[PDB]
Amino acid sequence: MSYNGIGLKSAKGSSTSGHVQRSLASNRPLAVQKQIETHMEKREIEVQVSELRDRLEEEETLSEEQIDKKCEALRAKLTNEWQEQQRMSSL
Amino acid sequence: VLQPLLPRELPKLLDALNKISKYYPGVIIKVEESGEHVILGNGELYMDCLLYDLRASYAKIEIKISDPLTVFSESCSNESFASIPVSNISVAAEPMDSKMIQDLSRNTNPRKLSKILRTEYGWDSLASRNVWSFYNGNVLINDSPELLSKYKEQIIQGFYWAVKEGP
Amino acid sequence: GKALNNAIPGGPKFEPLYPEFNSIDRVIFRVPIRSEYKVAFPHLYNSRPRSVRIPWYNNPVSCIIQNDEEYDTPALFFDPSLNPIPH
Amino acid sequence: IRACKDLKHIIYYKFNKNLGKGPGCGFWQPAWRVWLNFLRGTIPLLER
Amino acid sequence: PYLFSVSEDKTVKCWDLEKNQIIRDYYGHLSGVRTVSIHPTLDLIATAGRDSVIKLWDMRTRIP
Amino acid sequence: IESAGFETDLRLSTNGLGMCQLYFWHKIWRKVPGDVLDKDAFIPKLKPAPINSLSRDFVMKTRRRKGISTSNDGPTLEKYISAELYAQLRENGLVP
RNA sequence: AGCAGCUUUACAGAUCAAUGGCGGAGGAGGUCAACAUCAAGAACUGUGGGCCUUUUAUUGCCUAUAGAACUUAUAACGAACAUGGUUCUUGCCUUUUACCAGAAC
Numbered sequence A: 001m002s003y004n005g006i007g008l009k010s011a012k013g014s015s016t017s018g019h020v021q022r023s024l025a026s027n028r029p030l031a032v033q034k035q036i037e038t039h040m041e042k043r044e045i046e047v048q049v050s051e052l053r054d055r056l057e058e059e060e061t062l063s064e065e066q067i068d069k070k071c072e073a074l075r076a077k078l079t080n081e082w083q084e085q086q087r088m089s090s091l
Numbered sequence B: 001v002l003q004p005l006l007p008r009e010l011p012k013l014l015d016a017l018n019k020i021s022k023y024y025p026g027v028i029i030k031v032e033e034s035g036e037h038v039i040l041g042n043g044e045l046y047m048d049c050l051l052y053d054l055r056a057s058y059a060k061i062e063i064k065i066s067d068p069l070t071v072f073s074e075s076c077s078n079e080s081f082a083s084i085p086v087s088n089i090s091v092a093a094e095p096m097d098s099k100m101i102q103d104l105s106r107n108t109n110p111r112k113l114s115k116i117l118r119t120e121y122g123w124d125s126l127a128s129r130n131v132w133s134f135y136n137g138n139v140l141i142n143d144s145p146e147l148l149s150k151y152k153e154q155i156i157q158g159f160y161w162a163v164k165e166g167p
Numbered sequence C: 001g002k003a004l005n006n007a008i009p010g011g012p013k014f015e016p017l018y019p020e021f022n023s024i025d026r027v028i029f030r031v032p033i034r035s036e037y038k039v040a041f042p043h044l045y046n047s048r049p050r051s052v053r054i055p056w057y058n059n060p061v062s063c064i065i066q067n068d069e070e071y072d073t074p075a076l077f078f079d080p081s082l083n084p085i086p087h
Numbered sequence D: 001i002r003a004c005k006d007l008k009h010i011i012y013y014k015f016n017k018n019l020g021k022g023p024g025c026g027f028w029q030p031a032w033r034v035w036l037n038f039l040r041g042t043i044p045l046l047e048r
Numbered sequence E: 001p002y003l004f005s006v007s008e009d010k011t012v013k014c015w016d017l018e019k020n021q022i023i024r025d026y027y028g029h030l031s032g033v034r035t036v037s038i039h040p041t042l043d044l045i046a047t048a049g050r051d052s053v054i055k056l057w058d059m060r061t062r063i064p
Numbered sequence F: 001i002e003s004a005g006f007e008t009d010l011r012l013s014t015n016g017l018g019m020c021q022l023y024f025w026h027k028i029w030r031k032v033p034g035d036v037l038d039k040d041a042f043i044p045k046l047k048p049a050p051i052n053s054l055s056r057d058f059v060m061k062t063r064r065r066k067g068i069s070t071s072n073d074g075p076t077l078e079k080y081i082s083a084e085l086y087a088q089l090r091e092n093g094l095v096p
Numbered sequence G: 001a002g003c004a005g006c007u008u009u010a011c012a013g014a015u016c017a018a019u020g021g022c023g024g025a026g027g028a029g030g031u032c033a034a035c036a037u038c039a040a041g042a043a044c045u046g047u048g049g050g051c052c053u054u055u056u057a058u059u060g061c062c063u064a065u066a067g068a069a070c071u072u073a074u075a076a077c078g079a080a081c082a083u084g085g086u087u088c089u090u091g092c093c094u095u096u097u098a099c100c101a102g103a104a105c
């Protein structure tokens, strides 16, 4: 009977004792990254607009239309500041 | 992983697996795309018991089985280096925060959810609003809204297909 | 062991009762499947467990404290082996 | 005969633990049982 | 559920058809057995051959 | 993946004076050592792979088990993105 | 403990007709014997009622009720343990017996 897959099925018919011994002898910023950076910069503007929206909605004081108007105004302001900064940096 | 010893007996195995799937609630049995059957169980004794039931009572056929394996999962350890689009719609990914992984693993309205995310997880204002779905420990974030909202359902479905069979 | 033609240490040996899948390039080798595992969980660790009889799983760990050693030690005593109850 | 040889081995090594080699082990009960069981099966054979 | 077979080797054998194995052997014919007939209402079999005699065997004990 | 026969080894080593229970009610998922993209990781044919090769070994053995790979043909971004873009990514030092 | 109730196998006193209650008209053993029974739908008989079978003799099922000794769940009278036959597959072999050692009946 084998042990850990090693031995004979049986010693009978092998002409040997079947004794098994373990062998002691064996032992340029890729355009896609610039695209992600530009996306993150524009995202910061949209994040500011969304935060303003969150504040106005939580105050439950303004109608959804007035909140949309204030968000569009803030978006336009921040987008203009960003375009001016990009023009200045590229300059 | 298992398969019948004799292919002629595959339908008997199918019937037996259905019985097992019903009698062993916690077992998950799924046929893989290669045609081999996968059995997921709680441990070595659980498997030994269900395999005895297959061989001795439900299937009564001989079944070849693999050595024990485990269910792996695919993840990312850093943010995506580039916004690469695909064609045949660019998507990015990041390592989810430990705290949210743990709470989702324990299963713990849009404005309420945005409060949860902003106060305990510190997500920004947009992320806390644009979450489209939570599935198997993963999150899809949408960040003109009308331009995208046309196919929200189909995008979510694609995400559901991706999260259950990674690259 | 007899049915599986597997001989555990110190156990009896017998004649064998019986004369793409699992290829080494597809198998994850983490721990060798010991023969003891093949008798411990004979349905899980064998592909053809014919004539196998499922064994008794286990018995609660024994905690019988021994005595009759010192003539005057009582039947009930807090043996040195026991953890104290420090609450 | 083999069973008795095997019993002698386990018996003697239990018996001789701090005594060494030499006669003196008289624990014949196990080998005696072996021969009684041999007779149990030899009886019908020899009767026939 | 039995099959009876006879051969030139002088043997008469009963096969258990639930196992497809020989279970009973009827010894006694001096030479090759040519024919066998099962009794319709008794647990008996008739066999005959070159020894010019008919042997009637009780199925259970195998006694002629 | 390392738990096979753990209970048997424990019970035998302690001569029955020790018992164990293994469970997964706390869904702990841990990073397998090594890198998945290390296509040069050494992997013994029969013995357990070295620590740093585990992620590669487990991925490749899984792919071959599922028939996703014929070999060292493992996962790469080139299978989904266009060939000419990957040719650039490999020269930029992102992924060879 | 004292007091109270219920109960009566005993003792005493009173009573002692009938009726009722209660109890009764061998025991322990035997390296004695005979007979019966002991491995199965977890798997037992009888009495009573219904249906079927049976054809004067009883079987099976359902239902009601009474009893179920011994043996058995990491299954079995035996906390133990021999041999033989047939068949198959092996061993040593030089043919049989006698044998090797696994299986099945």
Ligand SMILES: O=P(O)(O)O[C@H]1[C@H](OP(=O)(O)O)[C@@H](OP(=O)(O)O)[C@H](OP(=O)(O)O)[C@@H](OP(=O)(O)O)[C@H]1OP(=O)(O)O
Residues within 6 Å of the ligand: D005, D008, D012, D016, D020, D021, D022, D023
């Ligand atoms: O041949 P050894 O290896 O030296 O063993 C011998 C041998 O026993 P076995 O050969 O059967 O193992 C003797 O038996 P015999 O040669 O006489 O048949 C036995 O003596 P007994 O006659 O009393 O059986 C003796 O026992 P002792 O220990 O008393 O010397 C025992 O020695 P060890 O087994 O201890 O080596």
